[PDB]
Design a protein around this ligand. Sequence first.
Ligand SMILES: [Mg+2]
Ligand SMILES: [Mg+2]
Ligand SMILES: [Mg+2]
Ligand SMILES: [Mg+2]
Ligand SMILES: [Mg+2]
Ligand SMILES: [Mg+2]
Ligand SMILES: [Mg+2]
Ligand SMILES: [Mg+2]
Ligand SMILES: [Mg+2]
Ligand SMILES: [Mg+2]
Ligand SMILES: [Mg+2]
Ligand SMILES: [Mg+2]
Ligand SMILES: [Mg+2]
Ligand SMILES: [Mg+2]
Ligand SMILES: [Mg+2]
Ligand SMILES: [Mg+2]
Ligand SMILES: [Mg+2]
Ligand SMILES: [Mg+2]
Ligand SMILES: [Mg+2]
Ligand SMILES: [Mg+2]
Ligand SMILES: [Mg+2]
Ligand SMILES: [Mg+2]
Ligand SMILES: [Mg+2]
Ligand SMILES: [Mg+2]
Ligand SMILES: [Mg+2]
Ligand SMILES: [Mg+2]
Ligand SMILES: [Mg+2]
Ligand SMILES: [Mg+2]
Ligand SMILES: [Mg+2]
Ligand SMILES: [Mg+2]
Ligand SMILES: [Mg+2]
Ligand SMILES: [Mg+2]
Ligand SMILES: [Mg+2]
Ligand SMILES: [Mg+2]
Ligand SMILES: [Mg+2]
Ligand SMILES: [Mg+2]
Ligand SMILES: [Mg+2]
Ligand SMILES: [Mg+2]
Ligand SMILES: [Mg+2]
Ligand SMILES: [Mg+2]
Ligand SMILES: [Mg+2]
Ligand SMILES: [Mg+2]
Ligand SMILES: [Mg+2]
Ligand SMILES: [Mg+2]
Ligand SMILES: [Mg+2]
Ligand SMILES: [Mg+2]
Ligand SMILES: [Mg+2]
Ligand SMILES: [Mg+2]
Ligand SMILES: [Mg+2]
Ligand SMILES: [Mg+2]
Ligand SMILES: [Mg+2]
Lengths: 46, 267
Amino acid sequence: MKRTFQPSVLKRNRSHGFRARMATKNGRQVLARRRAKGRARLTVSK
Amino acid sequence: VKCKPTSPGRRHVVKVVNPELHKGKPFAPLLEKNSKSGGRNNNGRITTRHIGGGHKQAYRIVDFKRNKDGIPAVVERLEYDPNRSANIALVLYKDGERRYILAPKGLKAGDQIQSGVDAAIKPGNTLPMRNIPVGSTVHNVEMKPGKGGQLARSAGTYVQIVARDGAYVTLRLRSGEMRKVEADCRATLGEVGNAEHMLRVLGKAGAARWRGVRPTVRGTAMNPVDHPHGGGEGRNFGKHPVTPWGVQTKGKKTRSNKRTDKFIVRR
RNA sequence: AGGACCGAACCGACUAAUGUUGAAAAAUUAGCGGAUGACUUGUGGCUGGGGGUGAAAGGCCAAUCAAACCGGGAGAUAGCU
RNA sequence: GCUCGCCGGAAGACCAAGGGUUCCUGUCCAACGUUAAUCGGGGCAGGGUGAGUCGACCCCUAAGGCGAGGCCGAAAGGCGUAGUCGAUGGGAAACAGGUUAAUAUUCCUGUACUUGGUGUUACUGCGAAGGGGGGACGGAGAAGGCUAUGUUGGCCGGGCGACGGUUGUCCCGGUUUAAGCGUGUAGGCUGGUUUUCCAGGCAAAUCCGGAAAAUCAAGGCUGAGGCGUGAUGACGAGGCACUACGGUGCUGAAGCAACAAAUGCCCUGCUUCCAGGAAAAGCCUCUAAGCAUCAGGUAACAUCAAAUCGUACCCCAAACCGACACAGGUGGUCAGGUAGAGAAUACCAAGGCGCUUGAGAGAACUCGGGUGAAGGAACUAGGCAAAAUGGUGCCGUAACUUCGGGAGAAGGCACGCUGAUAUGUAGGUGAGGUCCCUCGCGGAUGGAGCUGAAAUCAGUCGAAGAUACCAGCUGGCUGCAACUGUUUAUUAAAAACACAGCACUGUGCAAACACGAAAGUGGACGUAUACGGUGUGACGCCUGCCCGGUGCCGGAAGGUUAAUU
RNA sequence: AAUUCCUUGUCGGGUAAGUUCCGACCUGCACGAAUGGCGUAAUGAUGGCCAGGCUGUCUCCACCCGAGACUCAGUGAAAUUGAACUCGCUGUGAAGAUGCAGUGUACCCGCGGCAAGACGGAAAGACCCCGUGAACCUUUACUAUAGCUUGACACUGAACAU
RNA sequence: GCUCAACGGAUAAAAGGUACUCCGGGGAUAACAGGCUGAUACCGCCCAAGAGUUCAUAUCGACGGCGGUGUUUGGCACCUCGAUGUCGGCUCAUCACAUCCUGGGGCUGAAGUAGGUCCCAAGGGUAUGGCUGUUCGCCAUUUAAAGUGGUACGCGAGCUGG
Ligand SMILES: [Mg+2]
Ligand SMILES: [Mg+2]
Ligand SMILES: [Mg+2]
Ligand SMILES: [Mg+2]
Ligand SMILES: [Mg+2]
Ligand SMILES: [Mg+2]
Ligand SMILES: [Mg+2]
Ligand SMILES: [Mg+2]
Ligand SMILES: [Mg+2]
Ligand SMILES: [Mg+2]
Ligand SMILES: [Mg+2]
Ligand SMILES: [Mg+2]
Ligand SMILES: [Mg+2]
Ligand SMILES: [Mg+2]
Ligand SMILES: [Mg+2]
Ligand SMILES: [Mg+2]
Ligand SMILES: [Mg+2]
Ligand SMILES: [Mg+2]
Ligand SMILES: [Mg+2]
Ligand SMILES: [Mg+2]
Ligand SMILES: [Mg+2]
Ligand SMILES: [Mg+2]
Ligand SMILES: [Mg+2]
Ligand SMILES: [Mg+2]
Ligand SMILES: [Mg+2]
Ligand SMILES: [Mg+2]
Ligand SMILES: [Mg+2]
Ligand SMILES: [Mg+2]
Ligand SMILES: [Mg+2]
Ligand SMILES: [Mg+2]
Ligand SMILES: [Mg+2]
Ligand SMILES: [Mg+2]
Ligand SMILES: [Mg+2]
Ligand SMILES: [Mg+2]
Ligand SMILES: [Mg+2]
Ligand SMILES: [Mg+2]
Ligand SMILES: [Mg+2]
Ligand SMILES: [Mg+2]
Ligand SMILES: [Mg+2]
Ligand SMILES: [Mg+2]
Ligand SMILES: [Mg+2]
Ligand SMILES: [Mg+2]
Ligand SMILES: [Mg+2]
Ligand SMILES: [Mg+2]
Ligand SMILES: [Mg+2]
Ligand SMILES: [Mg+2]
Ligand SMILES: [Mg+2]
Ligand SMILES: [Mg+2]
Ligand SMILES: [Mg+2]
Ligand SMILES: [Mg+2]
Ligand SMILES: [Mg+2]
């Protein structure tokens, strides 16, 4: 049937993608939780 | 039904009930003074006033008060206006300006219709209550001498004053009991709106009801968590309000503001 | 004309068989209901957890729901195994 | 390579979404392919996506988001004015052949078009973030005309036939051809024009709106297709040479008419209905400030500019969502022949495939089917499952009924083919000839050719002619719920939820009520014929007695009673 | 009767025979008038009963056509599993024995088939009980609290009258 | 100064629902089946007042008495709660004997025919339907007859799911 996911790369970033992150309060932290705290090469996209 | 003309009964052949047509409004559609008006059942956040979906809206249309004094209008034709069944009127002023009014009773063609002081008592235009005889024939008043709201529900609605009730405050809305009000305020004095309208029965849900309002009915439907009274085998008992507010009788609106009016019902 | 009638697309799931370490974490086969409507569908948007949404079944809220998932208080407490 | 079989409203073709080199060539076969593998969407190399007209950027705004200042709020932060973003919607312009191993309305050829600057020429009042118009919008239905396109004929090229006949009556194939340019047609819509006057359009306006007069009409917008041109060009069956075996260079006939269609186009139409159907910009126009021999405006042409990204391939699937080369899921477009009501269904075109273990055997038993003597529901919880009915036309049809229905009730009869009526009929289509005229894709009269159902007699074949696929089983009594609808995604579709109707109750608008610490928002740009909450659930006849208990509504004199002094 | 315990009530009907069904009766264990009462044409993938047709549902299965099952070649799983040299019977026994006792029987090993036992496989039983466990729900349980509502003080002033 | 009376007295202050359920445990503890027991049940025998016209014992037997079985209704709580799937049906069974039919006998209140009862006997045989989920039962109609019981009330890694 229709698995729970579907595609859409334009609907995603508008939920995650530093403009979606930095725009929100705790959101700017999400990048720090990774980049600063952790060491993620790169984590913020679709 | 009881007056002119004969109102169809819709010949059931598909499980369909009577409607209530008029004659026409010679132009199926409006003019140039109307907005789009968005349409929701959420309050820029959550639900609220739950139930209300239907479809197709637009068509704002307007004008009230009728500040435009001593300058006559001519009624080109009647017309439509959604959500508020009460016709509308159009009108043209001798200078080429076009408002919309609110079709009182008999009118149609030409018709004097003019606002102002001591303009012309009949069922034409607005007129400061400060100048109104028996007023047993008054229209949409103004809770405040300047606005122009009150009962824009001209659909057969009344507000019979009391003729020459001085004191500078009186009035008698429909079932809304009585309530004193200023006199500088004005009234259309048309005092009507074709009540025959609000008489044919919608029909059968969807076929006309669904278009606007949703399944407002929820009843107990059990589930002792969704509503204050629910669950059980096949019945319900106990009090039957909605969110410990009580549904039977009660009354609300305390120390509000004005609170200067009278009479009212009880039972 | 009609929440009108028979019936494909489309939408849905009443019955039986098969499958049950499946082709498949709900389907296949033969039938079955709606099919101009409270219809059906693409794209994008809005409601956030004691909160939402609900033609109401505690149903749905990412194979999770009589209170989601992730991280934390946390080595909760466990007269029990 | 020849057969064979399968799909063909697709199992074909195109695109979006998503994917992100999977595309093409050469190579190699460890791992990956549920086997072998010389083969691949596998490995390693290379190569491969060329734009002023297609799309994104970009103007415009929807839902909604963000939001100077601002209003709120312990902090975080919420809301929101100007304003600024945001397509799934509106704004400008290209086609047909050709070509690559792979690109293609991007490259080549032939023929075009849009907009901006600059210039030359001519005529002229130009000018907003502003006013007006316009963009600009529903559902349903009923045509007519037309095109796509198919069929038949004519024309052109080709063959005379592994077996009886066909060497002119015949069989096969082709018969195509675009934007743009001229023509303003079947239709669609709407009276022009001039002058003056003004409490309107935030200021102004010749514009729009209103008012008077005056003179004519035969106008003015819109518009599918057709016809010329494009095009004595291209393409074109097919021949001739060369082949690497895929294919190449050259050459190249006819290329028309008649009928038949659409769900496409005229049609953002026409008719009609109630539930009364985005916005903003471009566009046209009117003026403001300002300009004031100027600049600008309109038109013609000359020229320059049209940047930058995307373009490969999969795309109902082996490239996307399902862990898989998974019998599942996935939006739009196109729409050939015979038969048919048809996008059903069957057989086929173009085209694409045989589904990545096979070879034998021919037990029980399991799955999917075919046929069954006599019986015919005896089976069983239950006719579960099967078997069964099944089409068009016509005859004919009960209780009951809200007069609509029940109803395809039920139950019957005719159906193939041939000849005739009639060499093709009724109907449909509409050619010169003729008649006339502002005038012409004119009109009228003529009815050639073309196409063509049904019926009625008569005859004939088989066991059977709605012969296959396809395609209601019918009726009688009774419960429940009026009825369409909704529900437990993944054991319940129901008598449950909803429903229209009814009733009670609350709400005078800063409404009741709800979201919210608040601001604010919904209710509603509504206002008691309105909005909310509760219960009942069409309709018909109705809906009795109890106010002791609890709750609610009114009173509030007297008793009891908080903080406070 | 979607309500009747007694219950297959009693009478009638349909049947060769009817704990169901339909029509009555009333003795309503324990119907009843908008937590609606009695009717109701039409509709229903709705519950119950009867009939015609139809038949492999059945008496009672037969044959046949295909996909497996079997054989060969290639690739190549699964749960489970203390260890095995893993027979029947009667008794025994923590109480239903391949394993103890007595006894009977039995040359060693595969292949295809069937499911009686290995209290067979699978999920620390969901029933039952318990823990001074959990959760969600209810109310005239207890204690609180948002909201609603009362009053005083205060932001809150000037005059007059009784 | 306390029916802290749940009287060594958890608080000053405390009711319920779960089939929407959940966890930690238990065969320390219920439900099915096994097991122990046999009161109860069923089967048999002892005494013999009575009935049987008469006559205790063809047939039956009061008041009372002793046992057999493991089969009903039960008692217990030993085996399973890190799972032993319930009733009925289908399929297919296997044993007992306290025998339903058939076979052989004794008595009879046995003329015959048919029976009554008791002894012996397990070779073989031992119904289709209507109603109901039924087992059973009642009813229709057959039959020589339509046996009683054990086998986890035989039989779901065999079917069904009323
Ligand atoms: Mg419920
Ligand atoms: Mg509650
Ligand atoms: Mg319909
Ligand atoms: Mg199906
Ligand atoms: Mg249909
Ligand atoms: Mg969406
Ligand atoms: Mg879920
Ligand atoms: Mg956690
Ligand atoms: Mg801690
Ligand atoms: Mg722990
Ligand atoms: Mg690669
Ligand atoms: Mg390839
Ligand atoms: Mg490769
Ligand atoms: Mg904001
Ligand atoms: Mg913008
Ligand atoms: Mg877009
Ligand atoms: Mg290509
Ligand atoms: Mg020959
Ligand atoms: Mg491409
Ligand atoms: Mg999967
Ligand atoms: Mg494959
Ligand atoms: Mg037969
Ligand atoms: Mg039967
Ligand atoms: Mg039977
Ligand atoms: Mg069936
Ligand atoms: Mg069939
Ligand atoms: Mg009944
Ligand atoms: Mg219904
Ligand atoms: Mg329905
Ligand atoms: Mg379900
Ligand atoms: Mg279901
Ligand atoms: Mg109800
Ligand atoms: Mg009453
Ligand atoms: Mg009855
Ligand atoms: Mg009742
Ligand atoms: Mg009811
Ligand atoms: Mg033993
Ligand atoms: Mg087996
Ligand atoms: Mg086990
Ligand atoms: Mg346990
Ligand atoms: Mg004690
Ligand atoms: Mg429930
Ligand atoms: Mg547990
Ligand atoms: Mg024990
Ligand atoms: Mg027991
Ligand atoms: Mg045991
Ligand atoms: Mg014996
Ligand atoms: Mg029987
Ligand atoms: Mg048993
Ligand atoms: Mg099984
Ligand atoms: Mg059942």
